Amino acid sequence: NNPLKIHNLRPAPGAKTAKTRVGRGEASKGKTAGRGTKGTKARYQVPERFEGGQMPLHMRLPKLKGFKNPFKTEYQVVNLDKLASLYPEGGEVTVADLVAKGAVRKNQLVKVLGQGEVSVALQVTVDAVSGSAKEKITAAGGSVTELV
Amino acid sequence: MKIKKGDLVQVITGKDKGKQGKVIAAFPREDRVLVEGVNRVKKHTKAAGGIVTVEAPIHVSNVQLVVEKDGNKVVTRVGYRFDENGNKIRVAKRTGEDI
């Protein structure tokens, strides 16, 4: 009885942590407010990319090897182990249906990969497939039809 | 200012409740009126210089019109009504009569 009233709401214990008010009193974060005395850090911030004049970490190790491809495309990949749990009775496997089962992002290229085992026949209609995955699908009586 | 000059009013909230009286002069800008008989102060004035007793204004919302209904007197609030030519006439509300 006595239902929930708006003055009965309390947060979960440990949810809200009281602020830390530095600079009030000497029985707390006292006069220095947790900084020490008279350094560059007693009044200012020291940038992270600065090793006191010594050659910075980011300036004495060589640049990374190689270039980058502006037009490289990455496929959303589905391993056979997690593709044999979405279809525990076989059937046709389309790309737009794989999207609806939360296995690949929308509007991308799918590429079934070969980790795991498949025990039922699947008719996968995807953009590509790896060699091991293709063998495993065919062994289980399925057929693989690529669009690309 | 509904309280016109020269009306019969009754003090409803003040040192002197009950007392009726006429409206001597009305100040429609500071919302006060003079009712003869109430708040009669004794000014100490010098030179015939001496104690003089005259009434000081009371707030308009502390008086209210007295309309006669069925013999004795009765305090009433005041509304308006047009007759035929768009002429507002003070109409009593306790009685519905014309004051």
């Binding site: 009885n1 239902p3 929930l4 009233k5 708006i6 009965n8 709401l9 309390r10 947060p11 979960a12 949810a15 | -």
Partner: protein, 201 residues
């Protein structure tokens, strides 16, 4: 659970089933607490500002130079009387982004809590025919004598809005804008049958 519909006069006019998913959902105090605190914070207007030593008018000059006084860079420094305010308030929006599911769940919890204590009521109408604050007052007296009452009615039903809006203790809402804060404040919740179906659907 089933609850009786009351006709505008206070008589029974049928029965309705409270959907369990709405009126029998779990009440999580921490979840309700966050949503309600978010509501009150979002209601804050937050229009409030002060002038820092840059915006105070004047003080562009260095007041003086071996003078024997303190060194000062401007007459509008924080420590000066009439100087600028340091770390003062500024205009800011206090609204919070709360997930949709948390909001909906909290309202379900609040309504479920009221239902469990049998404080949900339904009426086919508030007033029949003419607008009357008296008719609404009599109806609500029959339903409950408690201080806080919440009336949920479609905005197209002017009769109920106009009749009940003046009552000191009654807070009126559309079905679509039923919100957690109003439910918790109110001791009882009264739906119009049109409102109840609109909300549940």
């Amino acid at each position: 659970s089933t609850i009786d519909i009351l006709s505008p006069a206070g008589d029974k006019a049928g029965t309705v089933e409270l959907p369990s998913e709405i009126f029998d959902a779990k009440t999580s105090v921490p979840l309700i607490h966050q949503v309600v605190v978010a509501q009150l914070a979002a209601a804050r207007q937050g229009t409030h500002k002060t002038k820092t030593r840059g915006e105070v008018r004047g003080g562009g000059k260095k007041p003086y130079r071996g003078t024997g006084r303190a060194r000062q860079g401007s007459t509008r420094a924080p420590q000066f009387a009439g100087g600028g305010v340091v770390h003062g308030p500024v205009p800011r929006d206090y609204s919070q982004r709360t997930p949709k599911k948390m909001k909906a769940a909290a309202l379900r919890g609040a309504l479920s809590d009221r239902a469990r204590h049998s404080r949900i009521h339904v009426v086919t109408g508030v007033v029949e025919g003419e607008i009357s604050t008296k008719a609404a007052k009599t109806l609500f007296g029959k339903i409950s004598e408690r201080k806080n009452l919440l009336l949920v009615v479609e905005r197209s039903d002017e009769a109920a809005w106009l009749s009940a809006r003046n009552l000191p203790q009654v807070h009126i809402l559309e079905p679509g804008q039923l919100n957690t804060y109003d439910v918790l404040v109110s001791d009882d919740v009264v739906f119009t049958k049109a409102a109840f179906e609109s909300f549940v659907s």
